[PDB]
């Protein structure tokens, strides 16, 4: 569950 900086 690796989301980019902008997400979450």
């Amino acid at each position: 569950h690796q989301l980019d900086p902008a997400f979450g």
Partner: antibody
Amino acid sequence: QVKLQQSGPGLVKPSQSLSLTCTVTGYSITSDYAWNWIRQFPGNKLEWMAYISYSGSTTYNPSLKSRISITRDTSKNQFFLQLNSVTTEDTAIYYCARGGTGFDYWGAGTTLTVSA
Amino acid sequence: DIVLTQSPKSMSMSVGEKVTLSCKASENVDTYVSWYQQRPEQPPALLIYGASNRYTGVPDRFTGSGSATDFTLTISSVQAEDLADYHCGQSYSYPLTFGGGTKLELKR
């Protein structure tokens, strides 16, 4: 696999408000990823609007946060977008999308026409 | 918020050429640039993410590079099904942004 489908009014009076539904199949919106809303204007220019993380957090593009709101219904596994005091500058194509590593899955997107 | 400019507005070329599209940022965005393709009357589809990583399903003639500011989408061999609009967006900073897009036409 993942699947996104938009729906909602196709034509509205200016200044009115409304909600665009995004129903997803194949994945739980409480499981992971940010669930966004993106609109593309008549020129191919894309514009991010807002998203609702799987956890519940909400984020809005500063230039629209005055008149919009993202919400959800974990039960029916959907999320909606409300726009108020809409103007004609708002007619365009709206896409619901899942973001994680960039914008993963998109839907067919629905077109909206703001006219009197 | 960090502005993403796409240099080639409309690029005209032959099938089997070599096209390199450019995408620039206002500020550092590390490696968080994705490229999307959009055939007419069709929605964008992820092509390249993480600057280089090729998204599952993307053929080989597509390769990206670039580090926090200057990125490029290279299409080793152009095909007829590459004739479309290409967009790029960053996912590093809060308001996610896209560029104006780069349309790839056919030379005749």
